[PDB]
Amino acid sequence: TMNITSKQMEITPAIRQHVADRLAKLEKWQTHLINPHIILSKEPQGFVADATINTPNGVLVASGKHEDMYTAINELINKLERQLNKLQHKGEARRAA
Amino acid sequence: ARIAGVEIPRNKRVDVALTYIYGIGKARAKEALEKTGINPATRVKDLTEAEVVRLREYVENTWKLEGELRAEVAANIKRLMDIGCYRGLRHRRGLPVRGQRTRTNARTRKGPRKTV
Amino acid sequence: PLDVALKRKYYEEVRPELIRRFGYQNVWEVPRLEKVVINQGLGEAKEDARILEKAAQELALITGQKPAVTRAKKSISNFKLRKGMPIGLRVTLRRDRMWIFLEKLLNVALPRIRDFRGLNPNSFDGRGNYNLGLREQLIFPEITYDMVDALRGMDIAVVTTAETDEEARALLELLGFPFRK
Amino acid sequence: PRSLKKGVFVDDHLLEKVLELNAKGEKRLIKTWSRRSTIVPEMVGHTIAVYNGKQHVPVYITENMVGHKLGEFAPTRTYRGHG
Amino acid sequence: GKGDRRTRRGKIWRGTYGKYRPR
Amino acid sequence: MKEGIHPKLVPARIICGCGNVIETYSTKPEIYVEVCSKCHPFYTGQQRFVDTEGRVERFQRRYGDSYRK
RNA sequence: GGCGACACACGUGCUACAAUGCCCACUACAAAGCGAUGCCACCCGGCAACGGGGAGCUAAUCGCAAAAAGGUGGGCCCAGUUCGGAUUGGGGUCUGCAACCCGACCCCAUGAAGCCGGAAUCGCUAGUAAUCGCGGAUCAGCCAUGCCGCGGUGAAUACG
RNA sequence: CGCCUCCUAAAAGGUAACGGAGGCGCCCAAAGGUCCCCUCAGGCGGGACGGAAAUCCGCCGGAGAGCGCAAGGGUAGAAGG
Ligand SMILES: [Mg+2]
Ligand SMILES: [Mg+2]
Ligand SMILES: [Mg+2]
Ligand SMILES: [Mg+2]
Ligand SMILES: [Mg+2]
Ligand SMILES: [Mg+2]
Ligand SMILES: [Mg+2]
Ligand SMILES: [Mg+2]
Ligand SMILES: [Mg+2]
Ligand SMILES: [Mg+2]
Ligand SMILES: [Mg+2]
Ligand SMILES: [Mg+2]
Ligand SMILES: [Mg+2]
Ligand SMILES: [Mg+2]
Ligand SMILES: [Mg+2]
Ligand SMILES: [Mg+2]
Ligand SMILES: [Mg+2]
Ligand SMILES: [Mg+2]
Ligand SMILES: [Mg+2]
Ligand SMILES: [Mg+2]
Ligand SMILES: [Mg+2]
Ligand SMILES: [Mg+2]
Ligand SMILES: [Mg+2]
Ligand SMILES: [Mg+2]
Ligand SMILES: [Mg+2]
Ligand SMILES: [Mg+2]
Ligand SMILES: [Mg+2]
Ligand SMILES: [Mg+2]
Ligand SMILES: [Mg+2]
Ligand SMILES: [Mg+2]
Ligand SMILES: [Mg+2]
Ligand SMILES: [Mg+2]
Ligand SMILES: [Mg+2]
Ligand SMILES: [Mg+2]
Ligand SMILES: [Mg+2]
Ligand SMILES: [Mg+2]
Ligand SMILES: [Mg+2]
Ligand SMILES: [Mg+2]
Ligand SMILES: [Mg+2]
Ligand SMILES: [Mg+2]
Ligand SMILES: [Mg+2]
Ligand SMILES: [Mg+2]
Ligand SMILES: [Mg+2]
Ligand SMILES: [Mg+2]
Ligand SMILES: [Mg+2]
Ligand SMILES: [Mg+2]
Ligand SMILES: [Mg+2]
Ligand SMILES: [Zn+2]
């Protein structure tokens, strides 16, 4: 299933559940989210949310950064959505000719 | 329910068929037919009634078998679970007993996966 | 009637030891056998392959006596039980056939039972009758591994003129009934 | 297990207290950090507090538990499941 | 197969000897 | 007894493994069994087939005594 | 004492689900290495792990050492089995001051899942892939199915 | 809104209200005629799978069961099987 790693930090089951609820935005596209993996970590300037996810049509790899950790998580999602919507529709572009 | 309480398969050889008894493996298949002088290749369907009762008798009076072997194995596991030793606790939980790791695998003692 | 060993054992050995141990003043007071009732409560032949006749051919081999159908008193939803369904076999054994069946029961059948420990000593009526139940039917000498498909047991009621458990305990044991305790 | 050719191991320092109690008409609660020591019939009936790394666990010794080690009776991991 | 101690092939795998693999 | 519905009881010999022979009545004239009451271990006294063990445990072990006193 | 925990989840592997296979007995053909409280010939005891004797070798000499697949012959007969070897009971060996947590190995018995694997995904272009065994470092021992090497047998396919 | 049962209904019969409660508009080729046989529910104890209750055995048990369906009456010295 979905795995969450908190590198050199400690987090609560509540925060892990928030991440799972935010990753659920990707379920919109109705494609298989295969072993999604979120890495959470703290730089000196703020938090870093990493993610690697494979789908039937490719991989999603994105990194979000921000002072506020929930915002870094959201920036991660925004980058992941635009990658997934690309994987799902790019092949449609050259139907003609 | 011939010997020794298990209707051992015919059509197969005697050394094989004896293994279909709780307490008789390959090692005791070689043993029982050596004492009673029977060709281990002969099929159970071709045992002479003398060979049967000869093979039946030695088999039952020498080793603890089916029912009584099951009772002792249980009674040994029971008392381990009663003196409260470490091997006893692992039997009181279904967890493994011979030092194996449980972070992964251990599905024989645990059973198929219990989803959360 | 016939000359059978268990019957001869009742009259020559058992009756005197009973009179001895209890002091009966009348020959009719000493306990005796009334009947043995065997009952296969099959029930797995409800609306299922109600060709339980396979079992009827088995009890008839065991007893020498064609058993009789028992039918459902009422209907039972949870058992899938409609009133009047055939759900058992009861055969009543008296006189010579009773003696012949018990002779093989004690000598042959009971020793064949898996991991046999002896009959349940507390299974007495409270009023001088005994009841034992069996799991398989290969326990009896007339049933061989070939002819039998499924495993079916029975209930066995041993009825007795003794008025008390103690007297019926004495009669049965002296006949050869093995008791664990 | 331990070679039959060698002996039945008891730390000998724990064993001293066992026999000194048997003589005096035992007993008193024995504190030990000897999980490695075999139970021996001279110990039957006593109660010995066995260190599991954190606490000394008072364990009463009976007839049936003689071939074992003292550690088998003071488990070291507290665990009550998940959930 | 190789995981079966009670056979020669299993003893070759482990790297040991015994009744089922003599020296 | 009704007719044509009952298997006829005939004189019968049952044969156990221990040479025991039983002259009784049955619907098979000759029968073979693996065990009878003349040789079954619950019947024939405390015939403990294999394990007339005792226990044997626990102090039973006795290997050995050389630990000092 | 813990790092070896265990409702779960992923990565890497080992062994398999059998007949081009499994088992037994007999019989060949390597390379690279390691080895003076070390490697151990050969003898004896034990079914065995191993133990007691005891020769040789500062080692192109003596030893680990048998290579395995293969070859010969025999068993098995399509079955959860003579497939598979997990799990557990009982009994032993050895290292070690000490194998409870928490060692490897032997023996008896137990004989699980597994009938070729969804979405998805890895490797490999020639002595390669596949398959078979051997050695070494670490090391009292060993959880090595790992790693670094060594040879045996030996393919398929590439339009583009 | 017709029909059935009980109550109201004042111990014959009958007796009203937009009084209190329920049912019918079918069914059965046996669930009918006759002859013969049989006796319940329930409680306790005993009995493989088998349970509160399947089927078996024993003891007690006048009718509390049953009688296709409401209710009432009737009923085993049968109308019940
Ligand atoms: Mg996680
Ligand atoms: Mg955390
Ligand atoms: Mg990065
Ligand atoms: Mg958006
Ligand atoms: Mg067996
Ligand atoms: Mg381990
Ligand atoms: Mg562990
Ligand atoms: Mg008389
Ligand atoms: Mg009683
Ligand atoms: Mg009576
Ligand atoms: Mg039989
Ligand atoms: Mg195998
Ligand atoms: Mg007539
Ligand atoms: Mg430690
Ligand atoms: Mg670690
Ligand atoms: Mg989880
Ligand atoms: Mg998985
Ligand atoms: Mg591995
Ligand atoms: Mg894997
Ligand atoms: Mg592999
Ligand atoms: Mg080395
Ligand atoms: Mg199996
Ligand atoms: Mg299966
Ligand atoms: Mg097998
Ligand atoms: Mg064990
Ligand atoms: Mg250890
Ligand atoms: Mg197959
Ligand atoms: Mg394969
Ligand atoms: Mg695919
Ligand atoms: Mg290339
Ligand atoms: Mg292979
Ligand atoms: Mg190697
Ligand atoms: Mg090493
Ligand atoms: Mg009118
Ligand atoms: Mg009126
Ligand atoms: Mg009135
Ligand atoms: Mg009136
Ligand atoms: Mg009038
Ligand atoms: Mg009105
Ligand atoms: Mg109406
Ligand atoms: Mg009629
Ligand atoms: Mg009753
Ligand atoms: Mg009852
Ligand atoms: Mg029951
Ligand atoms: Mg009942
Ligand atoms: Mg009534
Ligand atoms: Mg109605
Ligand atoms: Zn006999």
A74 token code pair: 């959201």
Neighbours of ion ligand 1 (CB under 5 A): A 3-4
Scanning residues 111 through 170 of protein chain C, those with a beta carbon under 7 Å from any atom of strand H turn out to be 120, 122-127, 129-135, 151-157, 159
D69 falls within a domain: yes
Cα–Cα distance list, B24 to B8, B17, F46 (Å): 12, 10, 24
C114 to chain B, any CB pair closer than 8 A? The answer is: yes
Q: Count other C-beta atoms under 10 Å from residue C159's C-beta.
A: 19
Which CATH number do you get for residue D53? 3.30.860.10
Domain ranges of chain B: 1-71, 72-116
What class has domain B1-71? Answer: mainly alpha
Pairing mode, strands C68-71 and A58-66 = unpaired
**Please, what is the Cα angle at E13 between E7 and E15, to 5 degrees?**
100
Q: How far is CA A56 from the centre of its chain?
A: 16
Distance from Cα C161 to the centre of ligand 10, integer Å: 5
- What are the backbone angles phi and psi of residue F53, rounded to the nearest 5°? -70, -50
Whole domain around residue C29: which residue ranges? 2-181
D17 falls within a domain: yes
C146 to chain B, any CB pair closer than 8 A? The answer is: no
CATH 3.50.50.60 correct for A1-90: no
Q: Do C115 and B7 touch (CB under 8 A)?
A: no
Q: Is the CB of C79 under 7 A from strand H?
A: yes
Which nucleotides of chain H have an atom under 7 angstroms from any protein CB? 41, 45-59
Q: Are C134 and C113 contacting, i.e. CB atoms less than 8 angstroms apart?
A: yes
Report the alpha-carbon distance of residue C169 to residue C146 in Å, rounded: 37
Report the alpha-carbon distance of residue D61 to residue D70 in Å, rounded: 10
Report the alpha-carbon distance of residue C104 to residue C102 in Å, rounded: 5
Report the alpha-carbon distance of residue C151 to residue C135 in Å, rounded: 8
CA-based nearest residue to A22, from A59, A56, A53: A53
Consecutive H or E run containing B30: helix B26-35
- Topology, domain B72-116: 30s ribosomal protein s13; domain 2 (4.10.910)
Per CB-CB distance under 8 Å, the chain D contacts of B83 are 62, 64-65, 68, 73
Pairing mode, strands F21-26 and F10-15 = antiparallel
> Considering its fold, how many domains does chain C have in total?
1
* E-state strands within C45-135: 68-71, 86-93, 130-134
Q: Are F13 and F25 contacting, i.e. CB atoms less than 8 angstroms apart?
A: no
Domain ranges of chain A: 1-90
Residues 6+ apart with CB under 8 A from C2: C96, C100, F25
In the block, residue with structure tokens 């488990």:
D75
Whole domain around residue D74: which residue ranges? 8-83
CA-based nearest residue to C92, from C130, C128, C65, C71: C65
CA-based nearest residue to A74, from A6, A18, A32: A18
Which CATH number do you get for residue C19? 3.30.1440.10
Per CB-CB distance under 8 Å, the chain F contacts of D15 are 67-68
Query: Which approach determined this entry?
Result: X-ray
CA distance B99 to chain D (A): 13
The CA dihedral of B24, B28, B30, B33, to the nearest 10 degrees, is -80
Q: Do B61 and F51 touch (CB under 8 A)?
A: no
For chain D, give the secondary structure using H, E and C. CCCCCCCCCCCCHHHHHHHHHHHHCCCCCEEECCCCCECCHHHCCCEEEEECCCCEEEEECCCCCCCCEHHHHCCCCCCCCCC
Q: How far apart are the first and last CA of chain E?
A: 20
Q: Which ligand is nearest to the CA of D82?
A: 16
CA of C75 to C1' of H29 (A): 26
B16 token code pair: 């094989």
Buried b (16+ CB within 10 A) or exposed e, D19-55: eebeeeebeeebebebbebbbbebbbebebbbbbeee
Q: Which residue of B has its CA nearest to D61?
A: B83
